[PDB]
Amino acid sequence: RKKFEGPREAILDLAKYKDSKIRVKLMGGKLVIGVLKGYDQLMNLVLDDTVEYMSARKLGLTVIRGTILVSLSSA
């Protein structure tokens, strides 16, 4: 039985989820939803109509830094 090795596990996936709302949680204890417009390799990403749950507020186009991102899921 083939012993797999480390595998862009989502980077191609970044392509897949575009144009749709997604859920992002960031270091610090703050998450945010919003339609994903653009994305890069380093996972930095652009989100429209961003809402920032804190522990909500509207915010327009934004760039979230993919060096602080923690988990990304669809909403």
């Binding site: 960031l26 270091m27 610090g28 204890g29 703050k30 945010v32 417009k37 653009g38 994305y39 890069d40 930095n44 990403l45 652009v46 961003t50 920032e52 804190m54 915010l59 327009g60 186009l61 934004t62 760039v63 979230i64 830094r65 060096t67 602080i68």
Partner: protein, 75 residues
């Protein structure tokens, strides 16, 4: 649409910079390097969390270290 390009696009434009912790910085984006470390003009310093507390009206330039930068907001 590319994130950095979005920030390249932003230069010379009023920008908000939200940090992992409950603290927002707003002013004019003078420019940013690869680590996304940000340079800001006439920056207002905010700690939020509702009632907002303004901390300083930074007159002149500021080097804001990118570690903490979580979301960049045009305007």
């Amino acid at each position: 649409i590319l994130p950095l390009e979005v920030i390249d696009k932003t230069i010379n434009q009023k920008v908000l910079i939200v940090l992992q912790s409950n603290r927002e910085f707003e002013g004019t984006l003078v420019g940013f390097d690869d680590f996304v470390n940000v340079i800001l003009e006439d920056a207002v310093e905010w700690l939020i969390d509702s009632r907002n507390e303004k901390v300083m009206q930074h007159h002149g330039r500021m080097l804001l270290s990118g570690n903490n930068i979580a979301i960049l907001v045009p305007g």
